[PDB]
Write a protein that binds this ligand. Structure first.
Ligand SMILES: CCCCCCCCCCCCCCCCCC(=O)OC[C@H](COP(=O)([O-])OCC(O)COP(=O)([O-])OC[C@@H](COC(=O)CCCCCCCCCCCCCCCCC)OC(=O)CCCCCCCCCCCCCCCCC)OC(=O)CCCCCCCCCCCCCCCCC
Ligand SMILES: CCCCCCCCCCCCCCCCCC(=O)OC[C@H](COP(=O)([O-])OCC(O)COP(=O)([O-])OC[C@@H](COC(=O)CCCCCCCCCCCCCCCCC)OC(=O)CCCCCCCCCCCCCCCCC)OC(=O)CCCCCCCCCCCCCCCCC
Ligand SMILES: CCCCCCCCCCCCCCCCCC(=O)OC[C@H](COP(=O)([O-])OCC(O)COP(=O)([O-])OC[C@@H](COC(=O)CCCCCCCCCCCCCCCCC)OC(=O)CCCCCCCCCCCCCCCCC)OC(=O)CCCCCCCCCCCCCCCCC
Ligand SMILES: CCCCCCCCCCCCCCCCCC(=O)OC[C@H](COP(=O)([O-])OCC[N+](C)(C)C)OC(=O)CCCCCCCCCCCCCCCCC
Ligand SMILES: CCCCCCCCCCCCCCCCCC(=O)OC[C@H](COP(=O)([O-])OCC[N+](C)(C)C)OC(=O)CCCCCCCCCCCCCCCCC
Ligand SMILES: COC1=C(OC)C(=O)C(CC=C(C)C)=C(C)C1=O
Lengths: 454, 496, 54, 79, 164, 176, 55
């Protein structure tokens, strides 16, 4: 039901994001902010998904060696120069997107553009640096050196996307890590780090014209384009199970259950964001001002009552989106004996969206969704991530006002329609690590996606 | 400016009598129940997100943020900045921490935190927390050594409600016997949350050893044995009457209109009498130094900390000692930091790069109104403790001189840290509130940058010499079966 | 003129008692009032014969 | 748009006891910082599943006691 | 959309391109063309959207979907203005009376000079909003305004290109 | 859809009665007809039936309480949930004397005896529980309004509870 | 608690307690619970010898 518009005057009072396309095809996006610090970086449309099976892991390796010296600097000189500017260089690598962003002061904006351009365009992939990083990457590759939340994040993709490259991990298999060489990385740079796939984001005390001029000068020699990516069909969602039963790792079990989600540009994506908010998160060790027994979240409240002890030591919803697919589900960390109750309750919660979801819960979720999104845009790095991630995902940045406008239209009935179409009687994928005697078969859990009542 | 309070000028907001009927008209609209509704299909159900749908947007109105200072007639100071964000951060700071407790009042500051957001004169406990929840607000209360903070993060539109709820914790709290008894659980949770953070636990050990049974040393958390005898509503009320007063309180608001915040805060205190301000015993900290070796049977690693007394926040040594902390910097093997992340600090280059057995080495600089602690924190395997202490002592002996390149790098990194930390709104709120409580004044990030630029090598040498003349505080936590004795540390530092 | 915290404290439900409470509520010292039969009166004389056999 | 924070807000103070915005280091990458951007040792994305609550999990710790039992007492058939 | 049917990207591309040219080829000026066809177009458009959701970023399917959405927007907008013009002309015809005699004549629009200023503004707004659909805008709204011009002498930018 | 219309009717009818004064807070003048009724019937009915009957019952009730040695508020059964929630928060002094009186009353009633007259000169209708009954009702009304405004859906017959609302395990026949 | 119900409803014919208390609404208020008179150490009403003299 429609209860009015929550857009306010303050939402319109934000500096505009100016996006211009350079002649080579590189987009330059900037937003001015009244700050003494800035964030300037390069958000690229590269990642593990766009690697082949034999080369999986090259992108992650390159990201770890790109700041270890250039053809015009050395590692010590580069690190010294950044420190003198009072700046720090960051970088991450994902399945579909990558970034290389610097957090500096106002006077270091243009100087940092020069540093980042040199690293991206003229990386000196010294053999010694590669070999040392090979050891570090290999140690990280060991699952003993990986958290259980990182392990289940990767295994969810492995189980759900057996047929496509989205199932590949970022770090890569140990066989590939053992064999990556400079030539692999040089090829990856040539094919993927091209102007058409890069966005230069500058947030802070910045002027669009000046940033654009510097960008054109420093990125003049970048490869203009690479061949269009091979057209593929929708990533097939495999309803499978990948459970690592281990009764020798303590009492806590980690279970992740996934449904097929929606791509970034889907009209239903904001509905899935709201549904993710309704699921929410809960930790027995950080319950908040409201206790679990008296929580407005229905999943949390019913869970907190089970056996007078609570069946969720921790849980969170997740909504992962890619260009042509997505994953929607929940992650649980709970006592071994509580797993059956925990998965049963969260699946009952997701199934409830399709039958009996109250306006009260939706409206609370809208406010906490907006309180999480807006607070993320507080600092320059948060804004820069939002600009770079949103231009890659959508080709434009959605304004806070537009997000609120579209969220106003979504109500309990809209959530019910989307859930009924996509989540009710739907195929699921379960992945887990730990003592999981209580975890039932996939078919048993999949029947809990529909109700005999109502 | 109509009033000067502790070195800062405030504009005086006058109390006005308004009818409940007229103020109700200005309260933000919200519903708890939705009994029916007007169906309206999602108009954008078929519109992909890549297609803009909003048209005729009002032109933006950008104003350079400025910090504005006001004071009510009851003596409550209000300090607000508006960065024009869409989420606000309202906080209430009271100058009543653990340092003001008498030995018979042990833990009472923590107890006040535990009973926060319980029943008030005009709102039950359940109704306060369900309102904060339905409006999508997060927050809580934290009791420190010098102050206690009540914070709520909210969508700016709901500030009128949040201001009321926060202020009710200090204005008319009903410390009902059976609601207080339900808060005894939080003590055990607090101890577990502290001990989980090894760095903060070792910091608590440092302060207790540094200042023996006095102000800063006073335990931050209440114990769950003999302290529960006076964990009562009556005892809490007496403590609040002694220390909680409008003159010792400061309401900070980030991303809020100052005039609106002042109005609603005025309306909240207009028809009620705040706790009167009374004199209290305020004794300067007594630094004794000393040593404590705490054993954690489950930990195989040894955490060693050697600290020294600093004059504190109100001294002229504050900025120079902070440059010294950045100059010595430090890092940890667990972290893999890229360029500009402390890879060229003295500790990283002299300790981490040259001693593979050192798990982590860092410099620490706690700062309080009239005292502080500076020193090094180094960790490693238990059997390595004798060598870890030697490494720490050797670094302390190198503070006699500093190269020009190191000083410049430290100053630039410190300025970058100041500006980058400031942009976080929660950090800014806590910085402002803790500044006013400590000093009665706010030093802006730019002004601190100006001070940092004026630090010379002579200042660093002078400050370091003063620190090294103090009796060291020597804390070992974890596997302590191989650590040196305190006299070994003392004799090594006796030369300095 | 009282501080609000002090004013609301006086209205704890424990601070209200009915008028004449202390002068009317029975405060019993036993469940067997004086003049009522109990084991002291019903005990057999110490010279009694065994009552188990019967 | 992307969500950059966990669904469970921390609700705690960012700055540590006695540490200020001047002496907390750089909160973006300092080890003791409570808001340090996590490490991409194995790639980006795992933060959507990560538990950001610092206190380690105590399996089976009770949170559903309405005041019906004392600590250490085992309920029998819920009574 | 609630469906169990599965389609390849090639099939999705074919369906979307078929609908796009079907809409863009149909004569919008004839009202019965839109009244009869739009129900079938809306059923198809829902199916096309469901099967093309994965391919919104595709280099071939994506542009087809974007053009298809734009064409439907222009189709609804143009139909609205010409519907009002048809209302104005039918009010004028009824005012003529039975047999043109005036015998049983309806009352004649009084703000006709102002109703023609409203339509012409709408026509220009459509031209700006839908710059890549001018041929369709002129077929429906442009010709409609030319018919109105024969009744009331008013000025619009393209009046000379309509022989006025 | 006819349900969507009914939802608008309900929404609009409730929006039009928000803030209405309860029937008992309206200054009400009795109808002239009621006034005539209250001047003919009520007086005579009280003098001949109500008055005598209700004094006969009330005096007997006071005597029964005095015989048991208990107060009127002692007689409340804790199977009532408002009474239970009030008894949680009574002070120990009141609680101790309340238990002893109830124990003596049950002993006397079971043994078919009565309190000695020497101990019977007290007022049994002193409302010592009133403050705590009112507090308990307030607490329950908050929980009702803020936590029980909808017939919630829960997984049925799990964790020892039916899922239909009760919070104690093994508290129904079907939950054994 | 077992399946239970309380008649916590807005009556159409009976007023709430806040409007019409049914108890004898005269209470003594103190600043602290300790200031109440002690029942055990308080003299009670004098004993009577006839049931028709009971107060
Ligand atoms: C006023 C009437 C309006 C009529 C409108 C009709 C119309 O246009 O329909 C569209 C209208 C609305 O459709 P819609 O907008 O899509 O909404 C869908 C919902 O159904 C809309 O329903 P809803 O979601 O609003 O639910 C309410 C539903 C609730 O309906 C009921 O509860 C029905 C009544 C209860 C059952 C009565 C049983 C009586 C048994 C007696 C036994 C006695 C024993 C002694 O109400 C109705 O069914 C219609 C109510 C109309 C009046 C307003 C109330 O559709 C319906 O009314 C559908 C009703 C079903 C014959 C051959 C058989 C085969 C032979 C084979 C052999 C040869
Ligand atoms: C039946 C609708 C079906 C729609 C399609 C299916 C979807 C819905 C399924 C569920 C339906 C539940 C039954 C609803 C019955 C109508 C009552 C109602 O909700 O009225 C809304 C509203 C009363 O609001 P409320 O929910 O009572 O909230 C106000 C306060 O709670 C307290 O209020 P206050 O104290 O300020 O007001 C005094 C109160 C004092 O009255 C009461 O205490 C009411 C006691 C319950 C009355 C139940 C009436 C049941 C009528 C059933 C009709 C079924 C037709 C089925 C047709 C099937 C065809 C296939 O007066 C009323 O509630 C007036 C009731 C007049 C009912 C007239 C019904 C005509 C039927 C022909 O009444 C109106 O303003 C509309 C009256 C006309 C309704 C026509 C339908
Ligand atoms: C030889 C002598 C023969 C004499 C025969 C007649 C004797 C009649 C005696 C009883 C009636 C006296 C006069 C009543 C005047 C109007 C009262 C009124 O409006 O009350 C509202 C008023 C509400 O005020 P309140 O203080 O807020 O109530 C709080 C309660 O705790 C409520 O708690 P809650 O909040 O949980 O609510 C529970 C809900 C529970 O309500 C329900 O369960 C609702 C559904 C059942 C009742 C209503 C529908 C019954 C069926 C109607 C016909 C349907 C035809 C459908 C056709 C469909 C065709 C397609 O009830 C209410 O909310 C209030 C209504 C209470 C039920 C009774 C309503 C109807 C009153 C008239 C009864 C019949 C008179 C027949 C006369 C015949 C000619 C002499 O109720 C009262 O004053 C209290 C209840 C008094 C009545 C108790 C009835 C007990 C059940 C048996 C009734 C029949 C007994 C005699 C049978 C003899 C032969 C078998
Ligand atoms: C003269 C007429 C003669 C008629 C003869 C035929 C009579 C048929 C009777 C059917 C009874 C069906 C079961 C009882 C009603 C449904 C109860 C119900 O919804 O329970 C929910 C429960 C649970 O269902 P649920 O709706 O809670 O869904 C949870 C998820 N699954 C579906 C996996 C269980 O139903 C059952 O356990 C069955
Ligand atoms: C020409 C001459 C014409 C003369 C016409 C004379 C017509 C006289 C008709 C009088 C009808 C009076 C009916 C009163 C029934 C009250 C029932 C009631 O309280 O409903 C309880 C219940 C629920 O009522 P409720 O949910 O509103 O709650 C009532 C609860 N109290 C009273 C505490 C506020 O009614 C129903 O469930 C409706 C059942 C029927 C469908
Ligand atoms: C001028 O008046 C009239 C018309 O307007 C052009 C008609 O359409 C028509 C044509 C319609 C029919 C049914 C033959 C007639 C007859 C008419 O009188």
């Amino acid at each position: 039901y429609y209860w009015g518009s929550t857009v306010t005057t303050e939402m319109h009072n934000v500096s505009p994001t100016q996006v211009t396309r350079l002649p080579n095809g590189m987009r330059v996006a900037t937003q001015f902010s009244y700050t003494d610090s800035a964030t300037v970086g390069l958000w690229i449309d590269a990642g593990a998904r766009y690697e082949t099976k034999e080369s999986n892991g090259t992108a992650h390796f390159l990201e770890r060696v790109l700041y270890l010296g250039t053809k015009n600097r050395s590692r010590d000189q580069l690190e010294t120069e950044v420190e003198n500017l009072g700046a720090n260089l960051n970088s991450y690598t994902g399945r579909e997107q990558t970034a290389f962003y610097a957090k500096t002061t106002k006077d270091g904006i243009l100087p940092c553009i020069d540093i980042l351009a040199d690293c991206i365009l003229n990386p000196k992939l010294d053999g010694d640096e590669i070999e040392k990083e090979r050891v570090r990457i290999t140690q990280d590759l060991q699952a003993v050196n990986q958290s259980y939340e990182e392990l289940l994040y990767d295994k969810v993709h492995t189980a759900c996307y057996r047929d496509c490259s989205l199932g590949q991990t970022v770090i890569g298999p140990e066989e590939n890590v053992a064999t990556i060489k400079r030539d692999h990385m040089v090829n990856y740079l040539y094919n993927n780090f091209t102007a058409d796939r890069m966005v230069l984001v500058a947030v802070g005390p910045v002027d669009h014209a000046q940033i654009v001029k510097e960008a054109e000068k420093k990125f003049a020699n970048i490869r203009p384009t690479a061949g269009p990516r091979m057209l593929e069909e929708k990533p097939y969602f495999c309803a499978s199970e990948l459970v690592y039963r281990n009764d020798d790792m303590g009492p806590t079990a980690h279970i992740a259950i996934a449904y097929e989600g929606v791509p970034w540009r889907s009209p239903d994506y904001i509905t899935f964001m709201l549904m993710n908010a309704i699921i929410g998160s809960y930790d027995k060790k950080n319950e908040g001002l409201v206790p679990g027994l008296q929580s407005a979240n229905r999943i949390t409240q019913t869970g907190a009552t089970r056996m007078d002890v609570g069946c969720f030591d921790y849980y969170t919803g997740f909504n992962i989106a890619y260009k042509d697919t997505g994953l929607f589900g929940f992650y649980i960390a709970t006592d071994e004996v509580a797993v059956e109750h925990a998965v049963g309750d969260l699946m009952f919660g997701v199934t409830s969206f399709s039958y009996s979801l109250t306006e009260e819960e939706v409206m609370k979720a809208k406010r906490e969704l907006k309180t999480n999104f807006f607070s993320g845009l507080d600092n320059t790095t948060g804004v820069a991530e939002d600009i770079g991630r949103q231009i890659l995902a959508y080709g434009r940045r959605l304004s806070p006002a537009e997000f609120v406008e579209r969220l106003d239209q979504i109500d309990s009935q809209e959530v019910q329609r989307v859930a009924w179409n996509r989540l009710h009687d739907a195929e699921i994928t379960m992945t887990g690590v730990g003592p999981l005697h209580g975890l039932l078969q996939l078919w048993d859990l999949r029947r809990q996606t529909w109700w005999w009542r109502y | 400016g109509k009033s000067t309070i502790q070195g800062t000028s405030y504009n005086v907001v006058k109390f006005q009598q308004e009818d409940v009927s007229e103020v109700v008209k200005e309260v933000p609209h919200f519903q708890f129940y939705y009994i029916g509704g007007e169906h309206k299909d999602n108009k954008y159900r078929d519109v992909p997100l890549d297609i803009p749908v909003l048209t005729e947007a009002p032109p933006p109105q950008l104003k350079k943020p400025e910090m504005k200072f006001s004071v009510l007639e009851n003596g409550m100071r209000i300090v607000s900045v508006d960065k024009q964000g869409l989420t606000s951060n309202l906080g209430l700071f009271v100058h009543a921490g653990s340092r003001f407790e008498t030995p018979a009042e042990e833990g009472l500051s923590h107890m006040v935190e535990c009973v926060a957001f319980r029943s008030t004169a005009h709102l039950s406990h359940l109704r306060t927390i369900k309102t904060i929840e339905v409006l999508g607000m997060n927050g809580g209360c934290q009791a420190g050594r010098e102050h206690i903070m009540y914070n709520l993060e909210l969508l700016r539109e709901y500030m009128p409600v949040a201001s009321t709820l926060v202020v009710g914790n200090v204005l008319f709290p009903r410390l009902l016997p059976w609601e207080v008894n339900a808060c005894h659980k939080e003590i055990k949770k607090a101890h577990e949350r502290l001990k989980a953070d090894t760095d903060q636990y070792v910091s608590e050990l440092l302060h207790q050893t540094a200042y023996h049974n006095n102000t800063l040393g006073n335990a931050l958390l209440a114990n769950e044995g003999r302290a529960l005898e006076h964990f009562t509503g009556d005892n809490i009320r007496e403590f609040m009457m002694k220390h909680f007063s409008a003159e010792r309180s400061v309401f900070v608001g980030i991303n809020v209109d100052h005039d609106e915040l002042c109005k609603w805060l005025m309306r909240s205190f207009a028809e009620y009498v705040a706790i009167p301000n009374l004199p209290r015993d305020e004794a300067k900290p007594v630094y004794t130094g000393g040593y404590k070796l705490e054993e954690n049977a489950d930990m195989p690693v040894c955490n060693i900390a050697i600290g020294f007394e600093t004059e504190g926040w109100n001294s002229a040594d504050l900025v120079p000692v902070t440059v010294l902390q950045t100059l010595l910097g430090g890092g940890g093997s667990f972290s893999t930091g890229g360029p500009g992340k402390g890879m060229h600090s003295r500790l990283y280059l002299n300790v981490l790069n040259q001693n593979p057995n050192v798990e982590s080495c860092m410099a620490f600089n706690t700062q309080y109104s009239d005292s502080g602690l500076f020193g090094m924190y180094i960790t490693g395997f238990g059997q390595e403790a004798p060598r870890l202490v030697d490494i720490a002592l050797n670094e302390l002996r190198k503070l006699d001189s500093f190269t020009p390149d190191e000083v410049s790098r430290a100053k630039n990194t410190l300025k970058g840290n100041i500006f980058m930390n400031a942009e976080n709104s929660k950090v800014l709120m806590e910085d402002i509130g803790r500044q006013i409580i400590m000093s009665g004044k706010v030093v802006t990030p730019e002004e601190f940058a100006a001070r940092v630029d004026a630090v010379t090598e002579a200042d660093l040498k002078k400050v370091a010499a003063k620190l090294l003349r103090k009796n060291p505080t020597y804390v070992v936590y974890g596997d302590t079966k191989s650590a040196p004795h305190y006299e070994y540390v003392r004799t090594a530092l006796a030369s300095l | 003129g009282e501080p609000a915290i002090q004013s609301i404290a006086r209205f704890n439900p424990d601070n209200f008692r009915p008028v004449g409470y202390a002068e009317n509520i029975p405060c019993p010292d036993t469940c067997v009032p004086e003049g009522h039969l109990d084991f002291r009166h019903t005990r057999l004389p110490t010279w009694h014969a065994d009552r188990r056999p019967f | 748009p992307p969500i950059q924070k966990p669904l469970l807000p921390s609700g705690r103070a960012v700055l540590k006891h006695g540490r200020s915005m001047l002496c907390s280091g750089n909160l973006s990458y300092d080890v003791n910082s409570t808001i340090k951007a996590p490490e991409c040792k194995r790639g980006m994305g795992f933060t959507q599943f990560k538990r950001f609550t610092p206190v380690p999990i105590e399996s089976g710790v009770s949170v559903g006691n309405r005041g019906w039992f004392f600590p250490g007492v085992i309920p029998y058939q819920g009574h | 959309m609630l469906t169990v049917d599965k389609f390849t990207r090639a099939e999705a591309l074919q369906r979307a391109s078929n609908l796009y040219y079907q809409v863009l080829g149909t004569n919008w000026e004839d009202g019965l063309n839109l009244v009869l066809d739009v129900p079938f177009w809306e059923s198809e458009l829902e199916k096309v959207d469901h099967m093309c959701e994965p391919y919104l970023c595709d280099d071939e399917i994506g542009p087809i979907i974007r053009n298809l959405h734009e064409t439907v927007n222009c189709m609804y907008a143009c139909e609205d203005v010409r519907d009002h013009i048809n209302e104005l002309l039918e009010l004028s015809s009824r005012a003529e009376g039975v047999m043109g005699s005036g015998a049983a004549a309806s009352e004649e629009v009084e703000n006709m000079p102002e109703q023609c200023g409203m339509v012409t503004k709408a026509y220009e707004d459509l031209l700006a909003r839908y710059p890549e659909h001018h041929p369709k805008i002129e077929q429906t709204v442009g010709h409609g305004l030319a018919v109105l011009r024969q009744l009331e002498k008013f000025n619009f930018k393209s009046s000379h290109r309509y022989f006025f | 859809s006819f349900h969507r219309a009914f939802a608008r009717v309900v929404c609009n009818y409730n929006k039009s009665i928000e803030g209405s004064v309860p029937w008992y807070q309206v200054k009400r003048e009795k109808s002239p007809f009621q006034q005539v009724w209250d001047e003919v019937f009520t007086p005579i009915w009280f003098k001949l039936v109500k008055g005598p009957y209700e004094r006969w019952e009330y005096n007997a009730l006071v005597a029964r309480y005095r015989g048991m040695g208990i107060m009127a508020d002692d007689a409340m059964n804790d199977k009532d949930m408002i009474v239970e929630r009030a008894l949680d928060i009574i002070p120990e002094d009141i609680r101790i004397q309340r238990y002893r009186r109830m124990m003596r009353g049950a002993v006397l009633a079971g043994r078919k005896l009565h309190l000695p007259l020497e101990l019977q000169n007290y007022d049994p209708m002193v409302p010592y529980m009133a403050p705590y009954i009112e507090e308990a009702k307030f607490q329950m009304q908050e929980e009702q309004e803020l936590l029980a405004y909808h017939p919630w859906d829960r997984r049925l017959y799990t964790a020892g509870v039916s899922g239909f609302g009760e919070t104690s395990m093994h508290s129904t026949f079907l939950t054994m | 608690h077992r399946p239970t119900t309380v008649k916590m409803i807005d009556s159409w014919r009976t007023e709430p307690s806040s409007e019409k208390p049914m108890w004898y609404n005269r209470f003594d208020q103190v600043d602290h619970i300790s200031q109440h008179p002690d029942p055990e150490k308080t003299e009670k009403y004098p004993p009577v010898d006839d049931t028709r003299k009971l107060m």
